[PDB]
């Protein structure tokens, strides 16, 4: 229990089956995931006692948090990843179903709103119905990058009188962001209205996604043929960009950067090269992945994974390291007994050229391990150390 929010008041809803079921947007505050995590529940006992809970610590109230003057709950996973797709101009929805989506929203004034498209076939736009969730008067304006009142890229976000005028919806809008659709609805309509908004939004989006479906698998991890080769040389060239600086230091022709050894200044240059390359190898694939790519879609919405993720899966994992210094010579002047002494080449100080699609080599593997093993350690240190501080 780290902050107020780790403890909140909920309404009992007796259901069957042995598990405590809670909504998901309230998952974030406790830090709850379902790999088998448990949660305790205390039952108030006095009339005035439950009052304190219902009036002072009910989830609805905890929504916009003082820890950092912004909402602390918002849309996540499915609902989120799925709210994006439901938005894009590209996405149109037809009557028979729109009618269901309409119904699903427990408020809906039971007034089918005119399709944007009447022409040959009466079509409704994602945004359109989604907006039936957004109450009235909620006013919002964003402007991301190439945003422009006619936002081509379908950027930023414009919602008026509670209806989406333009721009896709994702994390930045319907997340626990600062200028949040949530941050606004809360302050503007009440902690109740907002509370129910998560609901409505969810039930629609959730439902729509149920039928539009979504997925992912290896197919989304392999980068285009040439974009791969194009990468194998982005790697390789950096290999020599290194080789040189290496001989150029074996000849004793390098200015020891003020305050640093030659060796100090040496590695420093090396590393900056590899990673530098690594990121590039990455970026390449990142933009090489088209919109239909699932892994990307997820990154776009902001529901999971980011740059470096695609990077290590499709492009190149990168230089593994420990305590700053790349792998070291635990084996008298070398890394493993599969190396000749005094070798400094990347292929020895722990640079993983292979991606995860490809597959590490024994060395690549073991080194990676040594790297991981460090995280797993300070993870178990920067934890209890944190604990004592927090107390």
């Amino acid at each position: 229990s780290l902050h107020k929010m780790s403890m909140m008041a909920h309404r009992v809803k007796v259901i069957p089956y042995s598990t405590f079921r809670l909504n998901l947007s309230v998952t974030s505050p406790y830090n709850a995931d379902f790999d088998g995590d448990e949660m305790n529940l205390h039952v108030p006992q006095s009339e005035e006692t439950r009052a304190e809970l219902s009036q002072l610590c009910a989830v609805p109230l905890q929504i916009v948090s003082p820890q950092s003057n912004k909402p602390c709950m918002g849309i996540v996973q499915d609902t989120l990843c799925g709210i994006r797709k439901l938005t894009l101009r590209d996405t149109f929805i037809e009557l028979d179903q729109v009618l269901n989506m309409l119904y699903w929203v427990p408020d809906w004034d039971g007034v089918i709103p005119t399709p944007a498209i009447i022409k040959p076939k009466p079509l409704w736009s994602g945004k359109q119905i989604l907006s039936v969730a957004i109450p009235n008067g909620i006013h919002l304006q964003r402007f991301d990058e190439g945003t422009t009142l006619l936002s081509p890229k379908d950027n930023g976000m414009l919602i008026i009188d509670g209806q989406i005028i333009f721009g896709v919806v994702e994390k930045k809008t319907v997340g626990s962001s600062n200028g949040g659709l949530i941050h606004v609805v809360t302050r503007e309509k009440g902690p109740q209205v907002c509370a129910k908004l998560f609901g409505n939004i969810q039930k629609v989006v959730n439902f729509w996604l149920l039928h539009n479906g979504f997925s992912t698998g290896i197919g989304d991890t392999i980068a285009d043929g040439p974009t791969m080769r194009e990468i194998t040389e982005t790697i390789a060239e950096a290999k020599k960009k290194v080789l040189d600086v290496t001989k150029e230091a074996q000849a004793n022709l390098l200015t020891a950067k003020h305050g640093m050894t030659l060796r100090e200044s040496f590695e420093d240059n090396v590393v900056r090269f590899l990673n530098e390359a690594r990121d590039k190898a990455g970026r390449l694939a990142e933009v090489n992945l088209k919109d239909l790519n699932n892994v990307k879609q997820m990154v776009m919405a902001g529901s999971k994974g980011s740059f470096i993720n695609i990077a290590q899966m499709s492009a190149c994992v990168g230089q593994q390291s420990v305590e700053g210094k790349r792998i070291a010579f635990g084996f008298v002047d070398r890394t493993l007994p599969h190396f000749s002494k005094d070798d400094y080449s990347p292929e020895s100080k722990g640079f993983v050229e292979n991606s995860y699609l490809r597959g590490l080599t024994p060395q690549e593997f073991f080194f990676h391990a040594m790297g991981g093993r460090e995280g797993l350690i300070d993870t178990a240190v920067k934890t209890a150390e944190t604990g004592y501080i927090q107390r």
Binding site: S18, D35, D78, N212, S303, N309
Partner: protein, 147 residues
């Protein structure tokens, strides 16, 4: 759990009539969420499936051993050899309506371990009960009925 530190708990269970399906009839036993793959970066899972979808078809114990000369490429080609999409995906229909699913799912087998620790051996509740003797506070342990 899978074989990739991919632990998880059930949340609901549906019967075939509700489960999504592939025109060929087959339906899933599990349905894990795409989201716990991009961040976890556990590609092996993905691959194990493709290789096992095949091995299941061809009936030849798939070799997913560490450092081998196998490749998704090889595996993809051989799966295409059996008529199913090259990467694994297939198109599926929504068991409720029967309409197609605008997307295609990553279908195919995977070895999953049912691990110890099941809800019913945990779910515990107490409202007044056994009390310690020194402390006069509630005893400890669901097994002793403590709070």
């Amino acid at each position: 759990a899978s074989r990739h530190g991919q632990k998880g708990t059930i949340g609901i269970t549906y019967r075939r009539e509700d489960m999504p399906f592939t025109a060929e009839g087959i339906v899933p036993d599990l349905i894990i969420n795409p989201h716990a793959i991009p961040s976890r970066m556990t590609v092996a899972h993905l691959i194990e499936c493709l290789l096992s979808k095949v091995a299941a078809l061809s009936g030849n114990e798939g070799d997913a051993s560490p450092f081998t000369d196998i490749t998704v490429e090889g595996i993809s080609k051989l799966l295409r050899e059996h008529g199913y999409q090259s990467r694994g995906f297939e198109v599926m229909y929504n068991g409720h309506t029967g309409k197609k699913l605008m997307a295609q799912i990553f279908f195919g087998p995977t070895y999953y371990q049912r691990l110890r620790h099941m809800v019913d051996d945990k779910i515990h509740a107490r409202a007044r009960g056994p009390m310690q003797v020194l402390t006069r506070q509630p005893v400890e342990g669901r097994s002793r009925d403590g709070g």
